[PDB]
Design an enzyme around this catalytic site. Structure first.
Site, PDB file in Angstrom:
ATOM      1  N   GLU B 288     107.077  51.148  10.115  1.00  0.00           N
ATOM      2  CA  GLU B 288     106.400  51.516   9.190  1.00  0.00           C
ATOM      3  C   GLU B 288     106.043  52.974   9.088  1.00  0.00           C
ATOM      4  O   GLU B 288     104.796  53.091   8.882  1.00  0.00           O
ATOM      5  CB  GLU B 288     105.236  50.609   8.746  1.00  0.00           C
ATOM      6  CG  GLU B 288     105.879  49.158   8.591  1.00  0.00           C
ATOM      7  CD  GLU B 288     104.850  48.083   8.395  1.00  0.00           C
ATOM      8  OE1 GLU B 288     103.559  48.247   8.869  1.00  0.00           O
ATOM      9  OE2 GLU B 288     105.153  46.842   8.067  1.00  0.00           O
ATOM     10  N   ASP B 361     106.677  38.489   8.578  1.00  0.00           N
ATOM     11  CA  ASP B 361     105.575  39.165   8.802  1.00  0.00           C
ATOM     12  C   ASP B 361     104.414  37.866   8.515  1.00  0.00           C
ATOM     13  O   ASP B 361     103.549  37.979   7.322  1.00  0.00           O
ATOM     14  CB  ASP B 361     105.131  40.137   7.724  1.00  0.00           C
ATOM     15  CG  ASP B 361     103.901  41.069   8.102  1.00  0.00           C
ATOM     16  OD1 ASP B 361     103.253  40.720   9.288  1.00  0.00           O
ATOM     17  OD2 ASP B 361     103.384  41.721   7.299  1.00  0.00           O
ATOM     18  N   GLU B 389      95.358  37.678   6.591  1.00  0.00           N
ATOM     19  CA  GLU B 389      95.800  38.624   5.702  1.00  0.00           C
ATOM     20  C   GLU B 389      96.686  37.862   4.760  1.00  0.00           C
ATOM     21  O   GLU B 389      96.621  38.343   3.427  1.00  0.00           O
ATOM     22  CB  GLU B 389      96.891  39.462   6.564  1.00  0.00           C
ATOM     23  CG  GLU B 389      97.719  40.361   5.654  1.00  0.00           C
ATOM     24  CD  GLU B 389      98.419  41.394   6.290  1.00  0.00           C
ATOM     25  OE1 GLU B 389      98.631  41.280   7.628  1.00  0.00           O
ATOM     26  OE2 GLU B 389      99.174  42.251   5.668  1.00  0.00           O
TER      27      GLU B 389
END
Ligand SMILES: [Co+2]
Ligand SMILES: [Co+2]
Ligand SMILES: [Co+2]
Ligand SMILES: [Co+2]
Ligand SMILES: [Co+2]
Ligand SMILES: [Co+2]
Ligand SMILES: [Co+2]
Ligand SMILES: [Co+2]
Ligand SMILES: [Mg+2]
Ligand SMILES: [Mg+2]
Lengths: 708, 708
Positions: B288, B361, B389
């Site tokens: 990322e 993820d 999340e």
């Protein structure tokens, strides 16, 4: 003691003799009324009296018993009405109250009497304050009424919950769980402010997010308003002038366009459907890139009056901030005055101009804003800063009471002697319609609300002075210390003096003698007096100090920018003559050679050095004072304040060394040998300014990865 | 109850008969040792026993009294030594303990015995837990030792104190007041984690800030490490691979460059000068946009080994994250395995690869990461997410215990039956030397640490399972409920079951049947299954579901991406055959026509709709269950959870409607008539996706002013 209760600590009175006396005087709590506000007063008295007197006191509506506290208005308490208090009570108005030891039907009582339920609430908090501060109730007869109408707090909170100039945690408002979750903390927030008589809150940032006017957010805001309402606190919102465009409803925000006028009328109707007693709007317009009427070629009155017209049928007001300065002018100091004086009289009667204490931006000392002495046909209100944007975030101890007092007691000569800022605000100088003061508090989710425990004292003093602008910083400090820490006289006196000097210390090792705006930009934590070459000169440091090899200061006399002509003649005369200008303001108005001799006998360079070093000494002395209080303070807060004072001392040294070495580099004069030479050189402190952690979540500087 | 104590609530045992029994058994607390760790154990037992037994129990070093709790090691307690425990203690190793009711010179005692002081600490917390959960001490005889070496928490905290994927307030670490202020909360944090046997913390974001390695910050970090040390918790830091460049010391970060190797060796020396028992580093590299060895044309072993060589002399380890995936590969699912498999055996012995539970993820359900069954010559550790999340931030109730258990008990067939993820982690399958689990907890300054009270249960389960990977989600929930809320059986059973279904509900209303990655990007709060056109396809939703008029799912069999060949043969076989693949994973591996019939008899379209509606029903049932518990829970937490559940139901309906209407738009099939039909169209929920407040300070979406 983790600070969550702030000054509303209802612990048993420590003086056993005084405790017994209070126990004999208040044996019962009589409350006939049952409105939400009376119920809130009763709940406060039940918890407060029970705690302070160490016995169960329960509010009851029963036949009057001997030795009762009796609360109410003539309209809701037959006992109070039976006293026929008449004119004496009536004169106290819609928010005032009378506290008095008396008799009713041969029963011994102490009354909390008022004309309105909120006056009972305010009086109830005062009655508790008398007990908390160990004042006697025998022969009590005291009345009070607020001297300003709008006594408001401001929160620069973004909807993401990060607070702009917020050093005390995230925003209190938990939007993700609103309106469903009515958190107890919302009620505790209301109790804190109502205890000071604060009657309004602007909950959102002046750099305004248009979402607050959407139904999604109004439903949330209405839940907060509902929590605040029984405590007498009205809801206000900061608004974005471009909202008609942001909502995609109109292709302009020009206040003279009928579609814009209608948009705001319709939006007001929506707001009042959710919050029937909504207070109104706070507006930051045409300042620092925020939208406004000038964006459409219109003036501030045209913009303000458009919003005011929308709110008038519902009884709302517009607080229009006069904090405006265009890149283009020659002296930023002159800006607001020159912008708004031509509009005096052009604002609607429900518009109030909200003006900061000084003409720049909450600097540690500023002269009074000239607008206060000039606008004679417009409603005005003061804006003070509590959050320590310029006084060291949450790491420095800086009681702001002396700054507020200094401001409020400043004689302006607007209409001759007696024209103090406080008298102007009260409406005793110019006949006016709307009076008030706003305080930028920026608390957050930290357990103690304010981060640094002593920021609580600044919030306290603000609210007390909003109620009575002649209350001194010392009086407020004495009350706060007793309520927050201890009633021991050996503690109160030294800690009060420590608090009272802390503001001046913050002036002294940042920017004494009328210096100003020497901060790192835009974070404002540490020193950067060398700041130059910014996109606007008025954002720099050099713009303000104008230091050179020959002198320092900014000429605002008749031979310079003539900002002094914006003041009443006696002020212009006093400040323009070197013989009468106060040294604590001198460099605001005069550019002086370094060899100018000050009252102390030192030349100006020597005096500058002396003041910077004095500020550090003052911090060190505060450290010594605090250490001497260990026996009187709980271990946790003791340790916390002790640690914070160490950080403050380190940062004060950094400030002193950075500024003295910087001004030395320009003046080329030695630091006298009786002052300790800084540990390092100028470049080292430029390096420290780039690398020293900035302790605030909001400002991007706290994320800076610069390491050299 | 404001949640500050979490599960360490030492309130008097409510069952009066059981309380009397405990009072008879533990009348005294005997502690001979006086190291910092033993002192911490003694302090915990003093406060814990005093609270639970409702009488003053003080740790003393005195002649043994009848009915004592006696704690120590044979080295620091002669009483413990006198029992000659022998082999009994040998099996406990460095961190285990023995709890036993026994006798010492005729005195009745209960012992907490261990080889190490930290073992005594852990045992002391277990002893307290037995009382808190109302277990009998009569005939007690149990021992326990942790099954994993490194039992660590991770905090994605930025130095500005904003937490990435942080729904519980600002970062705990108050950098502005460190190192000077040793806040009590740092110790409470240590108590919380030590109570679960957690022995390490990575305090800073994996998107790493190089400032943590500077002296300015090492001084602060050392203070935290000092607070954590007596509780057995070692300090770890996430590092930025480009640090040598960020510090301006080297013009490259290539791990093969001797200057770089030296830079890290010198930096390690500096770290260990401040923190002599420093744990080591966590590393997010070449992922990322974060820097890494691949930026210099080197591989992950070359990078990891360079850091490892710097830490080796001091006993430090490198946790190197395997969360890496490049934009140009065919199938992101395959990424980590294809990147790391060629490097098996190339990592140094003090490097551990930290691998998320699944290959994408932290999605509500993912198949196990193939790397766990493929790497046989490399140390590995698991990375779990506790912070929600993908399970609804701080507004949805989602106990993660079942997710963790499902993972740990997953059979991989790596090397025979019994090759569970848990057994692989323990080191027994592949015979590795360093083992562990990391949990991304992201707590904050909110009073209850986690925002949503039930996130505490996920943190609890993580720590329990890090100690013993076979502990079930039900066992951990039973413990947590007893410790946090109530021991009443009528409360425990329904609330435990509500907890146990909550994870599946969150799968069902978001992405059932092997669907995945249907979130709003990048904030992850709400639905956005239509997401496409992002700079990388693997960040979109459509990439994963591939929905069309004919079918849905992603072919990962031999006829598609053949990711199944990355798994052991028995797994590839089971998941590649439609007859044996679990329905809860099916769309991960197969693209199926909408007419495919599922085990229920429904076609796939019908089954998809059924699951989405079922998730909302499960939330509504959780609401009803919670309402039934009002008599057993304090009013404040009861109200908070009740309100949060309302928010969750509203959001679950939004998820359901958004996803069902979206998939309908692609499939062109009706929602069966028995279901409540949405009343608005798909565009309405695209508008809600753009306008619904995102409740997290960190992600920019929370600041979005979009209103249409
Ligand atoms: Co405090
Ligand atoms: Co922000
Ligand atoms: Co002092
Ligand atoms: Co000189
Ligand atoms: Co809680
Ligand atoms: Co950030
Ligand atoms: Co249920
Ligand atoms: Co069909
Ligand atoms: Mg500003
Ligand atoms: Mg991410």
């Amino acid at each position: 003691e983790d600070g969550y209760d702030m000054w509303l600590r209802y612990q048993p009175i420590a003086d056993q003799t005084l405790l017994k006396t209070y126990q004999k005087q208040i044996r019962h709590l009589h409350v006939a009324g049952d409105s939400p506000t009376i119920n809130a007063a009763a709940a406060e008295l039940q918890r407060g009296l029970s705690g302070l007197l160490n016995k169960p006191i329960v509010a009851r509506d029963e036949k009057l018993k001997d030795y009762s506290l009796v609360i109410g208005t003539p309209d809701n308490s037959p006992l109070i009405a039976s006293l026929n208090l008449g004119e004496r009570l009536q004169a106290l108005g819609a928010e005032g109250y009378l506290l008095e030891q008396t008799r009713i039907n041969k029963r011994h009582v102490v009354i909390v009497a008022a004309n309105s339920d909120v006056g009972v609430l305010y009086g109830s908090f005062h009655l508790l304050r008398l007990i908390q501060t160990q004042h006697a109730l025998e022969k009590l007869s005291l009345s009070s009424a607020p001297r300003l109408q709008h006594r408001v707090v401001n929160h620069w909170d973004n909807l993401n919950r990060v607070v702009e100039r917020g050093y005390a945690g995230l925003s209190l408002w938990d939007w993700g769980s609103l309106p469903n979750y009515l958190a107890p903390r919302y009620t505790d927030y209301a109790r804190i402010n109502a205890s000071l008589g604060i009657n309004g809150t602007v909950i959102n940032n002046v750099n305004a997010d248009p979402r607050v006017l959407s139904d999604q957010f109004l439903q949330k805001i209405a839940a907060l308003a509902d929590a605040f309402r029984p405590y007498g606190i009205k809801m206000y919102l900061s608004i974005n002038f471009n909202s008609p465009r942001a909502f995609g409803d109109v292709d302009t925000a020009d206040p003279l366009d009928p579609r814009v006028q209608q948009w705001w009328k319709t939006r007001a109707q929506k707001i009042y459907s959710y919050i029937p007693d909504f207070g109104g709007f706070l507006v930051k317009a045409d300042s620092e890139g925020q939208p406004g009427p000038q964006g459409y070629g219109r003036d501030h009155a045209e913009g303000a009056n458009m919003l005011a017209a929308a709110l008038k049928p519902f009884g709302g007001v517009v607080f229009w901030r006069a904090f405006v300065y265009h890149p283009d002018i020659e002296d930023r100091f002159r800006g607001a005055y020159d912008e708004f004086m031509p509009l005096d009289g052009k604002f609607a009667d429900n518009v109030i101009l909200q003006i900061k204490n000084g003409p720049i931006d909450f600097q540690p000392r500023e002269p009074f804003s000239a607008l206060f002495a000039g606008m004679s046909r417009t409603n005005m209100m003061m804006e003070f800063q509590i959050t320590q944007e310029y006084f060291g975030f949450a790491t420095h101890l800086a009681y702001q009471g002396p700054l507020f007092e200094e401001s409020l007691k400043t004689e302006t000569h607007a209409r001759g002697e007696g024209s103090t800022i406080g008298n102007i605000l009260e409406g005793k100088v110019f006949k006016t319609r709307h009076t008030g003061m706003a305080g930028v508090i920026n608390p957050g989710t930290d357990r103690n609300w304010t981060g640094h425990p002593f920021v609580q004292s600044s919030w306290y003093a603000f609210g007390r002075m909003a109620w009575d602008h002649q209350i001194s910083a010392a009086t407020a400090a004495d009350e706060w210390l007793r309520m927050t820490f201890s009633n021991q006289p050996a503690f109160i006196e030294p800690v009060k003096q420590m608090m009272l000097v802390s503001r001046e210390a913050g002036v002294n090792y940042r920017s004494p003698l009328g210096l100003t705006h020497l901060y790192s930009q835009g974070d404002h934590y540490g020193p950067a007096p060398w700041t130059d070459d910014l996109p606007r000169a008025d954002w720099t440091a050099v713009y303000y100090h104008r230091a050179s090899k020959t002198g320092i200061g900014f000429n605002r006399t008749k031979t310079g920018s003539n900002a002094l002509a914006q003041y009443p003649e006696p002020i212009a005369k006093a400040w323009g003559d070197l013989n009468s200008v106060p040294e604590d303001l001198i460099l605001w108005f005069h550019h002086l050679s370094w060899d100018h001799r000050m009252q102390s006998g030192r030349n100006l360079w020597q005096e500058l050095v002396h003041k910077y070093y004095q500020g550090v000494e003052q911090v060190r002395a505060m450290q010594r004072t605090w250490d001497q209080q260990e026996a009187y303070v709980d271990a946790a807060r003791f340790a916390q304040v002790k640690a914070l004072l160490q950080v403050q001392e380190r940062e004060a040294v950094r400030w002193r060394n950075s500024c003295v070495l910087y001004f030395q580099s320009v003046a080329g004069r030695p630091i006298p040998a009786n002052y300790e030479q800084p540990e390092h050189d100028l470049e080292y402190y430029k390096m420290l300014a780039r690398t020293t952690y900035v302790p605030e979540p909001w400002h991007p500087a706290s994320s800076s990865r610069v390491l050299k």
